[PDB]
C-alpha cells in the first residue's frame, strides 16, 4: 500500500495571504503515461468532500484558479493563492494510481480572523426535566475568535469539577467564529441543595473573566 | 442534474451485519464508484471500488474479506454487504465517483453520506427540554436533546424557516452512555415575543419526532 503523507496537520491563515500544503507518497504516482495520479479534496464544515485538483495539477470544474496544484512523482504541493473565509475546511490528498486507494491525514485550514470576545449565556432548567431526576444548566459562548477559552462552572463561589462537557462548533464559512456550549448536569436533589448557579467564562477577548448567574427559584 | 442518496445505515452489533444501498440518478453504470468512509471526528478513509466494466473490484486492507462491493445496473444502485462489523467501522459512508474526466472537464459527485454505528446499546428515543430567554440574570435560546442513541438528531427550527444565527452543536456521550446535544438560536433582544420559536427533533432510528415550542 501506498503510504500519503500530508504536513501540516493544521494551517492558521490570515485571509489574503498564500496558504501551502504538502503531500508525500512512499511510491512515484506517475504512470507509463504522464498522468501523476494525485487528487487534492476539501471538506467544507458540514458537507461532503469537494474535488479541488486532479491528476495532480490539473484545476476541477468550478474550482477558482486561486487554487492551484503543482509537483510530480512522490511529492506534490496544493497552493492558494489568496484564502477566503469560505476555504474553510479539511484537505486531503489521495492517489489513484495503484489499489487500494489512500487518502494522506487531512490538513485542517484555520481561517485567522481578528478577536472576537464571546456572547455569554446561562441557560437553567426546565421544571419538565427536574421533574426526571436530573438538572441541565447550559452555558452558551457565542461567535468567538480564536477558539481558545477556559469555561468553569461556580456553585455557590465552589468550583465544581468532573459534572460538566464541552461542545464546539467548526469555524463558521462566513464569519470565521467558534460557538461552544457546556453543560453542568446534577441531580434534582444535588440541584435543590444550592441556590447560585454561575459560569465564568475566560477568553482573551474579555479583559477580565466574565460570569453568568442564576439563582433557582426564579421563572 | 446528478445526485446521489445513500441509504441503509443505522446501528449493528459487533459481529452482526449491514448492507448499504447507493442509489443515483442522472449521469451511473459508465463510471467507477468507490465507498469512502469517515470515523466521527477522523478522517477519510478509501474502502471499496468496482469497476463499470463488469466486476474488477478492489478493496482496502482493512475491510478485505469482510466487505463486498456490488451493483445493481437493472436498479440503477451500487450496493455494499458489510459482514462481520466490529466498532472500528463506525463511520459516515459515502459513495462517490472519484474523478470523472471527461472532454477537457473533471467533475466529481459525492453522495449525502450515512452513518453505520457499531455498538451493543439499544436504540433510544431522546427528550427534548427548552432552554428559554430571560434577562436580568442579544438574547438566546434553544432546545436540550438528551439522552439518545445512536446517532444522529436532526434539530431545525421554525420548521426549517429560521436558520440565521441557529448553532446546533455536535453531539456529545455523555457517562451514561447516551448522546446529548442542545441547538440554540440567538436573536436581536428587542424582538420579545416578535416571533416564535419551535424547534423540530428528528431521531429516525427511534421513530420519535417531538416540536417543542419555547418562549419565556
Known amino acids: 500500500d501506498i503510504v500519503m503523507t500530508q504536513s501540516p496537520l493544521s494551517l492558521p491563515v490570515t ?23 494525485l487528487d487534492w479534496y476539501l471538506q467544507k464544515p458540514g458537507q461532503s468532500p469537494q474535488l479541488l485538483i486532479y491528476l495532480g495539477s490539473n484545476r476541477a470544474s468550478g474550482v477558482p484558479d486561486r487554487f492551484s496544484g503543482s509537483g510530480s512523482g512522490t511529492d ?33 485550514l484555520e481561517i485567522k480572523r481578528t478577536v472576537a470576545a464571546p456572547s455569554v449565556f446561562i ?97 | 442534474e446528478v445526485q446521489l442518496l445513500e441509504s441503509g445505515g443505522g446501528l449493528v452489533q459487533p459481529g452482526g451485519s449491514l448492507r448499504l444501498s447507493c442509489a443515483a440518478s442522472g449521469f451511473f453504470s459508465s463510471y467507477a464508484m468507490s465507498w469512502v468512509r469517515q470515523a466521527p471526528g477522523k478522517g477519510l478513509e478509501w474502502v471499496s471500488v468496482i469497476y463499470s466494466g463488469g466486476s474488477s473490484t478492489y478493496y482496502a486492507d482493512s475491510v ?23 466498532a472500528e467501522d463506525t463511520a459516515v459512508y459515502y459513495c462517490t465517483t472519484l474523478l470523472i474526466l471527461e ?3 473533471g467533475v466529481d459527485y459525492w453522495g449525502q453520506g450515512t452513518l453505520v454505528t457499531v455498538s451493543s446499546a439499544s436504540t433510544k428515543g431522546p427528550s427534548v427540554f427548552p432552554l428559554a430567554p430571560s434577562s436580568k440574570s442579544t438574547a438566546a435560546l434553544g432546545c436540550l436533546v438528551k439522552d439518545y442513541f445512536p446517532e444522529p438528531v436532526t434539530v431545525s427550527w421554525n420548521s426549517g424557516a429560521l436558520t440565521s444565527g441557529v448553532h ?43 416540536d417543542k415550542k419555547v418562549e419565556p
Not at chain 1, 80 to 105: H, K, N, W
Not at chain 2, 192 to 210: A, F, R, W
Request: glycine share 6%.
Open chain 2, 168 to 210: 446546533t452543536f455536535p453531539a456529545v456521550l455523555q457517562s451514561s452512555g447516551l448522546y446529548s446535544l442542545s441547538s440554540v438560536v440567538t436573536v436581536p433582544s428587542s424582538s420579545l415575543g416578535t416571533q416564535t420559536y419551535i424547534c423540530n427533533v428528528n431521531h429516525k432510528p427511534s421513530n420519535t419526532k417531538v
Open chain 1, 76 to 108: 506534490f504541493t496544493l497552493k492558494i493563492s489568496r484564502v477566503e473565509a469560505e476555504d474553510v475546511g479539511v484537505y486531503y490528498c489521495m492517489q489513484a494510481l495503484q489499489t487500494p486507494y489512500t487518502f494522506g491525514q487531512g490538513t485542517k
Open chain 2, 103 to 105: 472532454s477537457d472537464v
Open chain 1, 123 to 219: 441557560f437553567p432548567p426546565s421544571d419538565e426535566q427536574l421533574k426526571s431526576g436530573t438538572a441541565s444548566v447550559v452555558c452558551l459562548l457565542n461567535n468567538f475568535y480564536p477558539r481558545e477559552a477556559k469555561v468553569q462552572w461556580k456553585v455557590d463561589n465552589a468550583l465544581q469539577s468532573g459534572n460538566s462537557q464541552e461542545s464546539v462548533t467548526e469555524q463558521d464559512s462566513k464569519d470565521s467564529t467558534y460557538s461552544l456550549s457546556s453543560t453542568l448536569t446534577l441531580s434534582k436533589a444535588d440541584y435543590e441543595k444550592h441556590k447560585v448557579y454561575a459560569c465564568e467564562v475566560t477568553h482573551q477577548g474579555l479583559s477580565s473573566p466574565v460570569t453568568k448567574s442564576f439563582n433557582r427559584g426564579e421563572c
Open chain 1, 15 to 37: 485571509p489574503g495571504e498564500p496558504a501551502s500544503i504538502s503531500c508525500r507518497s512512499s511510491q512515484s504516482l506517475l504512470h507509463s503515461n504522464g498522468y501523476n495520479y
Open chain 2, 64 to 86: 478485505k474479506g469482510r466487505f463486498t462491493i456490488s451493483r445493481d445496473n437493472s436498479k440503477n444502485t451500487l450496493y455494499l454487504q458489510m459482514n462481520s462489523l466490529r
